Amino acid sequence: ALGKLQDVVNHNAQALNTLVKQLSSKFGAISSVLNDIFSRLDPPEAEVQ
Amino acid sequence: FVIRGDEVRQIAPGQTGNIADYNYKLPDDFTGCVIAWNSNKLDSKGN
């Protein structure tokens, strides 16, 4: 019957987990690693990603 | 400034180049315009 209390814990954990997952998303850029963008691309094109 | 002739790509601002690295770099806005043209017979003759 403590599911209602548990749901609050899960909801916060689920939301926080989503935030961490969103970090790995490239969001349309070539890669999700910041240093990779700067190193591989020239500074003019790198800033676009 | 003068240039070798085939390195006009190197002087493009924000992009590195061996002639650029030893001599010139530009900001990256670099707001100003860049104009160039060959000056073969003006400065080449064994010079």
Walk me through this protein's architecture:
This is part of a larger assembly, with two copies of chain A. Chain A contains three helices and no strands. Chain A is mainly α. The interface between A and B is small, with 3 and 3 residues. It is classed as viral protein/immune system. The entry lists the keywords viral protein, human antibody, VIRAL PROTEIN-IMMUNE SYSTEM complex.
Chain-wise SSE layout:
The structure is cut from a larger assembly and holds two copies of chain A.
Chain A: H1 3-24, H2 34-40, H3 43-48
PDB class: viral protein/immune system
Keywords: viral protein, human antibody, VIRAL PROTEIN-IMMUNE SYSTEM complex
Entry title: Structure of SARS-CoV-2 Omicron BA.1.1.529 Spike trimer with two RBDs down in complex with the Fab fragment of human neutralizing antibody MB.02
